[PDB]
Each structure stands twice: as C-alpha cells, then as structure tokens.
Design an enzyme around this catalytic site. Structure first.
Site, PDB file in Angstrom:
ATOM      1  N   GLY D  67      92.498  94.476  40.766  1.00 60.11           N
ATOM      2  CA  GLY D  67      93.276  93.310  41.149  1.00 60.11           C
ATOM      3  C   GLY D  67      93.432  93.181  42.647  1.00 60.11           C
ATOM      4  O   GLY D  67      92.528  93.523  43.416  1.00 60.11           O
ATOM      5  N   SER D  96      88.131  99.252  40.731  1.00 61.10           N
ATOM      6  CA  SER D  96      88.346  99.427  42.166  1.00 61.10           C
ATOM      7  C   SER D  96      89.767  99.824  42.558  1.00 61.10           C
ATOM      8  O   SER D  96      89.969 100.864  43.192  1.00 61.10           O
ATOM      9  CB  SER D  96      87.960  98.123  42.867  1.00 61.10           C
ATOM     10  OG  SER D  96      88.803  97.059  42.455  1.00 61.10           O
ATOM     11  N   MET D  97      90.770  99.026  42.187  1.00 58.69           N
ATOM     12  CA  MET D  97      92.137  99.404  42.539  1.00 58.69           C
ATOM     13  C   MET D  97      92.651 100.510  41.630  1.00 58.69           C
ATOM     14  O   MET D  97      93.288 101.453  42.106  1.00 58.69           O
ATOM     15  CB  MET D  97      93.076  98.201  42.474  1.00 58.69           C
ATOM     16  CG  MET D  97      92.813  97.100  43.494  1.00 58.69           C
ATOM     17  SD  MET D  97      92.646  97.620  45.219  1.00 58.69           S
ATOM     18  CE  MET D  97      94.016  98.759  45.393  1.00 58.69           C
ATOM     19  N   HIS D 121      84.122  99.750  43.884  1.00 56.58           N
ATOM     20  CA  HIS D 121      83.347  98.794  44.660  1.00 56.58           C
ATOM     21  C   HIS D 121      84.125  98.433  45.918  1.00 56.58           C
ATOM     22  O   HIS D 121      85.309  98.750  46.055  1.00 56.58           O
ATOM     23  CB  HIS D 121      82.991  97.536  43.851  1.00 56.58           C
ATOM     24  CG  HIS D 121      84.169  96.717  43.416  1.00 56.58           C
ATOM     25  ND1 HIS D 121      84.956  96.008  44.297  1.00 56.58           N
ATOM     26  CD2 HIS D 121      84.663  96.457  42.184  1.00 56.58           C
ATOM     27  CE1 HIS D 121      85.901  95.372  43.629  1.00 56.58           C
ATOM     28  NE2 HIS D 121      85.744  95.626  42.344  1.00 56.58           N
ATOM     29  N   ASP D 170      78.655  98.062  43.184  1.00 61.30           N
ATOM     30  CA  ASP D 170      79.372  98.631  42.050  1.00 61.30           C
ATOM     31  C   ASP D 170      78.700  99.906  41.559  1.00 61.30           C
ATOM     32  O   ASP D 170      77.487  99.940  41.339  1.00 61.30           O
ATOM     33  CB  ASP D 170      79.454  97.612  40.917  1.00 61.30           C
ATOM     34  CG  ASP D 170      80.199  96.357  41.314  1.00 61.30           C
ATOM     35  OD1 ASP D 170      80.553  96.227  42.503  1.00 61.30           O
ATOM     36  OD2 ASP D 170      80.435  95.502  40.436  1.00 61.30           O
TER      37      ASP D 170
END
Ligand SMILES: Nc1ncnc2c1ncn2[C@@H]1O[C@H](COP(=O)(O)OP(=O)(O)OP(O)(O)=S)[C@@H](O)[C@H]1O
Ligand SMILES: Nc1ncnc2c1ncn2[C@@H]1O[C@H](COP(=O)(O)OP(=O)(O)OP(O)(O)=S)[C@@H](O)[C@H]1O
Ligand SMILES: [Mg+2]
Lengths: 192, 351, 350, 192
Positions: D67, D96-97, D121, D170
């Site tokens: 997000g 990612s987060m 990523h 990614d």
C-alpha cells in the site's frame, strides 16, 4: 439478520449469535469467496480454539466457490501448525481452494455430504506489462501450480503425475468419486 | 554415641521409600539437634540457632509416616500436633500453648527435657489464608493461629499447668522456653502448584508464539513444588513472618509407578504383608505375583490418592474372596495374578 | 539523660543498615526524658508527647532494636505482644497486666515504673476487622486498641503488689501512664498496597508519556516513608491511636552490603554458628569473601530479611553435612561462590 | 460478521470480539491494503500494549498486498520507537510494504509460514503537471527509494548494491528463500 440463541450455564442464561454459539463447540464456518479478510478471521478462530483445548478436534464446514491462493495458504498452514486435528466437511460444494482445504484436513476426519460437488482446477492469473515482468509473474504461478499439486498428492495419496493431468482442466467430482480419489475419507448420509 | 545422618536415614529408608531428600533434611536436623543437646551452650562463645523444617508434599507421600517413624528412634521426647485444632487466643477452640503441654506429658512434666524437644505440626496448610490479603473478617483458625505461633517458633516462655492445673495460686504455670524446641511443619499445600506455575510458566497466549502443553507436557506437581519459593507461599496464604521462622523447606515427590511397586513389599509394614498376616492367622497362605503388583500400581496412580490408592485396589480384588473364604474349607493357599487385578478371572485357590 | 550519639552508637553495634531509623529512635527517647526532668513544661505551651511506631518489613531488626535498647537504658523494659492481648473478661488475656508486668521488673515501685519503657510487638495483628456471623464476638481488634489507647491518654493503673492474694485488701498501687514511654513495633503487611494506590501516578500511553516497567515500578522502601494517617485507618488502626503516635520510625529492606556484614561481623553471626558446629565434630569451616555476596543476593530474593540467610546456608551445606560424619580423612571444608549457586560441590581438603 | 468469545476472569465472565481477545494477548493483525486509517489503528494498538507491559513482546501478523509508503513508515517508526520487541509473522503473503514491515521486526523474532509468498519491489508513483513540478516529485520518490533500500539492507543484512539490483523489478521469494536473503529468521512449520 443473524438469530440470537440462549445458552443455559451454571452462572446463568447468556445470549449468543448463531455463529458464535457454534464457535464455542469448535465449529468454524468457511463460506463464500476466499479472501484475506475472511481468512484472517478463520485463522483467529483456529488459534483461539487451540488455546482453549489443544486436544479436542476442530471442525471446518466448507461451502465456497474458491478464491485467492495466498489467503487459502494462510488457513492451510494454520491448520497444519496447530496441534488439534482439523476435521473438514463439505456442504454444497468445494472448489479449487475449498477442495485444497478440504483434503488438507486430518487423515480419517475428512467428510463430505452425499450430494456435495467437489471441483479441482489449476491456478488462474494474469499480468499486463513489459515482457520482462510477464516472465517474472509467469514463473510464480507455475511454481504455485507445482507447489499446490505436490500438496494435493500428499493428502489425496495420488501420484504427482496423475494430479497434473486431472488438474489441467476443471474436473468435477461427486462425493463418492472424491472418496476414491482421496480428497475425502467418508460420507455422512444419516446420523447413526 | 552420636548417630550419624546415614544411620538415621537407614531407619527411615526401612519404612519410607523414595523420599531421599526428606530423609536427608530430617537426618541432618536431628543430627544437629543432638549435638546442641550433647554439647550445651557453655563453652562456645556463640549460641547455636535452630532451623525449622517445612515438609511440603502431596497426599500419601510419607509426610506423616516420616514423623511417626522418627519417634521410634528419637531419644529426645517427641509429640505430634494438629493445626486444625489450634486457634488464636481468646477463642473457645484451643490455644497454641497446648502443644507444649502435650510435649511435657511425654517427659513427665520435665521442664529441662521439654525445652530441648522436637515437635511436629501436621496439616499446617489448613491454617493458611485464602489469599495474600490479610483478612476480611476475624479468622480464628487461619492467620490468627500463625500470628500466635511466631512467638512459639522463635522462642518464648510457655505457661502450662504443672500437675492438674488445680489447687494452685494462679495455676502455678510452668515457664518453659521454646527457643530450642525444633519445629517441623508438614502439610499438603493443595493448589500451590498453579501459583508456582503462574510465575514459572510464561507466554500463555493464543497466537503462534504462545506456549501450549495440552496438559500432558505440563510440569507435574512434584516438579513445580521443587521450584517453590517464599514469594509463592505469600500468594497461597502463608503469613510472611511465619515463613521466615521456617528457613528449611523440604519438598516430597509424587510416588511413581516403580516406587509404589516397591512399597507393596519392601517396607517393614507393607500393604501386602498386612493382608498376608490376615490370611496366616486364619490358616491360609496369600501369594501375590510380581505382575499383579505392577497392575495394582497403575490403578492406584489413576486414583490420585498416592499410596492410599493401593489399599482400595487390593480391597476390591479380594472383596469376594474374603467374603466366602472363612466359610469355605480345604483352602490352604490363595494365589493372586495380573488377571485378578483386571477382573477377568477369579483368584486361584489351592485345594 | 543519655546523649543521642551514645544511644545510636550502642544500637549500631548490634544493628546494621538502619542508621536512619536509629537516629529517630535516639532523638525521640532523649527528648522524652528531657521533658520528664522539667516541671510543668517550664513554659505556657505544652510539649508534644513522644510515642514511636516501629513500622518495618520482616527481619528488619524491629525486635532487635527494642531488645538491644533495654541493655543500655537502666530503666525497666518490658516486652508484650498485641496478639496475646484480648478484651477484658475473656480467656485470652487482659491489657492492664502490661503495667503489672513492668512493675515486676522493678519490684513494684511506682517511681521506677513511671520511667519505664513499653514495647508492644506485633501491633498490626490487632487491626480492626469486620464482624463474622460464625464467631460469637471479636475479642481481638479495636476493643484491644481502646484499652491500650487509655494508657496513652494518661491514667493511673491499679496493680496489686508483691503478688497480693485474691483478697482485695485495697492495695491498688496507682502507676501513671502519662510518663511511661509507649512503643509499638509491627510489620504492617499489605500496607504497601493501599499506599501505592494513593501515590502512584500511573503509566501513560502516548509517545511523549512516561512508561513504567515492572522492574522499576516501586518497592516497599521509599513507599512507607510517605505513610499517612488515612492509610493506617484503612488497615484497621483506630484514628485516635494514630494521632497519639506522632513519631514514626520506618525501616527499610536490608541491602546486599548490610546482609554481608551480618554474616560475619556479629559475634553470633550465622557463619560463626556453623563454624562452632563443625568444630564440635573436629573440622574447621571457612567462608570465602565472594560466597557472602552470593548468599546475600539469594537472601534478598527470598524477601525474608536476615532469616533468609539461614535458608541458603542450610541448602548449600545439606549434602556435605549428611555425608561429613560418615566420611573420613576430612580435616577442612571450604565453600566459595560457585557452591552457593549449586553448580559446584563443597570443597574438601585431604 | 465478527464472532464473539467468552473469557473467564476473576471478576466474572467477559465478552470480547475475536480480534479484541487476541489484542489482549499482544496480537495485532495487519491485513489488506495499507493506508492512513488502518495504519493509525495499528499505531494505537502498539502504544496501548507498550503501556500495559513494555517488557513483553508484541506480535504482528502480516497478510497484505502492500500500500501507501507514508502509512507504512508510521508503523515502522512506531515499532523501532517502543521498547517492546515486535515479532513479525507472514501469513499468506507480504508485498513491498508488508515485506518491509516484516523484515523490520526484531532480529531473531521474524517468522514466516512455509507456504507464504514474499515480494519486494521499488516504489511506484506518478505526477501530472508542469515540468518543474515533475522534477520536484521525481526527486522525492527517488529519495524514498534510496531510503527504503538503505533500511532493508540494514534489517536483511544484504549489501545496498544487491538490494538495488533485486528491487529494480518485482522479485518473489518463498519462505526458505527469504531466510537466506535475510527477510525472516526461521519458519514455523509445526507446534513444538
Ligand atoms: N513413601 C512411602 N513409603 C511407604 N508407604 C507410604 C509412603 N507414603 C505413604 N505411604 C503409605 O501411606 C500411608 C499414609 O501416608 P501419609 O504419611 O499419611 O501421607 P501424607 O503425606 O500424610 O498425606 P496426608 O496425610 O493426606 S497430608 C502410610 O501409612 C503408608 O502406608
Ligand atoms: N539489622 C539487623 N542487624 C543484625 N541482625 C539482624 C538485623 N535485622 C534482623 N537481624 C537478625 O534477625 C533476627 C530477627 O530480627 P527481628 O528484629 O525479629 O526482625 P523483625 O523485623 O522484628 O521480624 P518480625 O517477625 O517482623 S518481629 C535477629 O535476632 C538477628 O539475628
Ligand atoms: Mg499427613
């Protein structure tokens, strides 16, 4: 609207929602499209029951058309991590994820209703972008497909090669056919 | 001469099986007590102090049995008391000074012998408070009894009637110091295990990082009690001042299946020998198979009554036989086997 | 008459780690005697009475201070316990006999008795309690506190001298209780809870708040110093009784350093006791300087004060004492810090 | 519908929702798309548990597809600030987060389930407007990219150069692969 039921206890009468009342009896309801939100809810219910009595067996009713793979793996890993044997039951139907979770139940405690319909298929996915990114995402779904087929062979007992051929396209299995395949152990026709 | 601790322990081993730690503490305490009496505090500039023992242990572990056996070899006068009867001053129940009165009776009201005496107080856990809080209402049989014992354990003159407590101005109460009277407080502190478990065991949550034992891998009462600390007794209900008066703490272990099997034949007064003597006086011989004893041990352990459980199993197995054995004739020997314990077959009779 | 320094020096010889408490006691007793010498207060204003309250944890030297103080002071010193005391006319005891007990020490002379000191140990055990249906009456409690309070207010007590017979004969020696120093020393277990609820600020939740871990939350030491009359009333003490005791001597839990001195410095120290015990068997006992630190650390955790030391020593020496008589060729036994931990066995010299 | 559970306490019976009951046991659920509102809720739970017991360890169950970065930093900064060690467990997936928060957990207390899927990523953003404004926002996102890479290298233990190469596109890492990369420490296969 969910109905409220009264439970008689030594302390006194208490009001419970129909789903919470069954949770007290180690019954978890898996319904609808699988997703992260409902999956975390099931995970919390499993961990909660494990603390109350890690010896008693948990029950997981499955009536779902499938959903996200990642959300399902959280439920699968949780079922295997905890000590209690999770007894899966199939009501109405069990799609790809519902079937993968159904067969993931403890050996000898997997059941299905006589008219239930099971279905197993390979993963579905897609990506839009550069060719390099497409290759990256394509390799993951292939790994997920291979990883899911390995686990299905472990639970069902069928060879990995057979699972690949049968899972290439949508395959529907009735309750008796599922017993022979290995997805379930017995059928619950009537209460004895 | 002065008996060594090993000699004292040998006598206890004859009657008590498996309580090695309790025997060592009791033997050392008796050994030190004899030295003080043997060598009065006359030459030594320093005055030797006594160390009281607290015999914690489950039911049927031999706490009461150890005290009785000790009196057989204790040259010093010894007496046994009951904490339940004791009550604080000013109440109809009883007084703590009555304990000293009983001890004097053993030595024929000899003050000097009474001062150098050993006293045993069973069921000391019964007077424990319900919680760490002092009380909500006056407790005649509880912390109040412990408050009166503080002066008695540490040391103080105790008023006891010299002879009959009658026809004497002011009752002529004899004043006997209790500073040198060793005190052994043995009790079955039921529920203390969960208190110790609260601090010893942590991480009892719901998530992945929590600790779940399933009641099988949890520490047993014997293991938990061995880790007992004074702070734990505070929560159980024991007064802090009372605990200080009892520095030595002895923890008995739960009798195992192997230990119970030995108790059936090894001790001088064993369960099998008791029933065997019953048959010998009536003209019959009682024989117990080794396998039968093992079966009885398993059943007794499930009862949770410790050694007392064995008596129940033997009574049930021989219930029918004892009922018809006297009227029967041509009974010369009775053999008990594992099958009888299970209830599958009747005990063999020799005709 | 005795200077406060002289009184403190005598107590220091037998008491270790209670320097603050000893100062209050020395000043209190010295001021009390000064008032006795003066007649009619020598001024319009009335001098406040000196009544000490020896509140402290278990094994903090409360009884030791009172017992050792009597040796220095020539005045008659009597020791009683509130636990034994009960309401008048009951099987337990009568409070008025305390004055009679004091007279026995000085052969029933009112002049000496007036200058005597009283020490009521275990004062907290008579705290007021609620009524119990099963119990007929609560003889011990506030009723006993009223009798003791009457003596503090100042009242002549009638005492039969030379153990008078049952015949009354109207002897009734009157001994005033206004000049008799009254000291009450008890361990008020649980008082820390009520005091903390009043003086504990609490832990905040925000980023800028102050978080208080259980490690440095609080302790009985530095908490009893803030004792007030309201908390004592909740314990069960009568408010009038508290007002009559302005002087308050609060003791603190002995520190590691203080416990180390008690192990060897006193003549009747724990180490010397066992040394004499071993010497009676023909062996000498030696304690290493490092071992004393470990014993003090274990004793502090027990929270039983000085008595905790005996527990550690008996446990560490349990094995050797059991086998030492049976063993031969053992002429010396040495104990070190490692033995205190329990990992190592007592060292034996052959 | 969230089920309700009963907890036995000294005062008496108490009713809690499944999520609140687990919060009592120092369990925080991070589920779904990360955003300002859900992040502030998680921040409030961390601060609340810190006050209750700053010595015990807090647990964070991460099942999210990633997000907003700013919302994640509020959670990351809160974790490092508070004294309690935060244990991160990955259920289902950690994008990612979620992966950045997963690896940000206390060293030695980071866990992953066997069938979990972790993906890392570089940041993605966009701006429409004048060239001058583009230069401003373009520089800002690059700074965030460098800052995120610098923090991941610290927690994972990999070199900064290696992180830049791997996070350029990614990259999907399974539970065993994550252990080697340094994102997590161990895998929770079964209850011991
Ligand atoms: N270690 C033992 N060896 C042999 N017999 C034992 C042993 N422990 C218990 N027994 C038997 O059990 C009987 C009762 O034992 P007790 O010493 O009274 O047990 P306990 O510790 O007193 O438990 P209580 O009285 O409920 S607190 C004895 O008379 C023996 O017959
Ligand atoms: N400050 C001290 N210095 C030296 N020995 C001490 C000290 N405090 C306690 N002791 C030792 O501990 C023994 C008992 O001390 P007490 O004065 O009875 O402690 P306490 O605080 O009165 O305990 P209770 O049960 O509350 S009366 C003494 O005889 C000493 O051997
Ligand atoms: Mg008993």
């Amino acid at each position: 609207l969910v109905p409220m039921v009264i439970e008689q206890t030594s302390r006194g009468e208490r009001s419970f929602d129909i789903y919470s009342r069954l949770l007290k009896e180690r019954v978890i309801f898996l319904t609808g499209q699988v997703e992260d939100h409902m999956a975390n809810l099931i995970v919390a219910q499993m961990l909660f029951l494990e603390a109350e009595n890690p010896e008693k067996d948990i029950y997981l009713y499955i009536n779902s058309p499938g959903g996200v793979i990642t959300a399902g793996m959280s439920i699968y890993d949780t079922m295997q991590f905890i000590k209690p044997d999770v007894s899966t039951i199939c009501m109405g139907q069990a799609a790809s994820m519902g079937a993968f979770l159904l067969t993931a139940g403890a050996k000898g405690k997997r059941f299905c209703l006589p008219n239930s319909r099971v279905m197993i298929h390979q993963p579905l996915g897609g990506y839009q972008g550069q060719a390099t990114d497409i290759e990256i995402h394509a390799r993951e779904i292939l790994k997920v497909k291979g990883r899911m087929n390995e686990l299905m062979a472990l639970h069902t007992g069928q060879s990995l090669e057979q699972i690949e051929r049968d899972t290439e396209r949508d395959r529907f299995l009735s309750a008796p056919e599922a017993v022979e395949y290995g997805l379930v152990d017995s059928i619950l026709t009537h209460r004895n | 001469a002065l008996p060594t601790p090993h000699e004292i322990r040998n006598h206890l081993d004859d009657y008590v099986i498996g309580q090695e730690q309790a025997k060592k503490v009791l033997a050392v305490a008796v050994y030190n007590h004899y030295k003080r009496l043997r060598n009065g505090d006359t030459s030594n500039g320093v005055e030797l102090g006594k160390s009281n023992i607290l015999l914690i242990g489950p039911t049927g572990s031999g706490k009461t049995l150890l005290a009785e056996t000790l009196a057989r070899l204790l040259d010093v006068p010894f007496t046994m008391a009951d904490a339940t009867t004791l009550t604080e001053a000013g109440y109809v129940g009883e007084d703590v000074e009555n304990i000293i009165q009983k001890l004097l009776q053993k030595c024929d009201y000899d003050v000097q012998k009474a001062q150098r005496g050993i006293v045993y107080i069973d069921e000391i856990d019964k007077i424990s408070r319900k919680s760490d809080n002092p009380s909500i209402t006056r407790d005649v049989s509880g912390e109040g009894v412990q408050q009166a014992l503080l002066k008695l354990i540490e040391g103080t003159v105790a008023a006891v009637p010299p002879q009959g407590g009658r026809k004497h101005p002011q009752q002529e109460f004899l004043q006997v110091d209790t500073s040198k009277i060793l005190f052994i407080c043995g009790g079955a502190f039921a529920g203390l295990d969960k208190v110790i478990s609260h601090r010893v065991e942590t991480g009892s949550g719901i998530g992945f990082g929590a600790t779940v034992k399933a009641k099988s891998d949890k520490a047993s009462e014997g293991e938990l009690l061995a880790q007992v600390e004074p702070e734990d007794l505070i929560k159980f209900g024991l007064i802090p001042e009372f605990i200080g008066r009892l520095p030595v703490v002895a923890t008995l272990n739960e009798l195992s299946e192997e230990a119970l099997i030995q108790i059936l034949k090894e001790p001088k007064n064993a369960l099998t020998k008791q029933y065997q003597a019953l048959f010998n006086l009536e003209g019959v011989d009682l024989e117990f198979r080794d396998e039968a004893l093992d079966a009885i041990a398993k059943k007794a352990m499930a009862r949770k009554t410790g050694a007392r459980g064995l008596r129940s199993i033997v009574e049930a197995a021989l219930l029918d036989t004892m009922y018809d054995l006297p009227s029967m004739e041509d009974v010369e020997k009775v053999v008990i086997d594992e099958s009888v314990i299970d209830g599958q077959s009747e005990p063999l009779l020799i005709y």
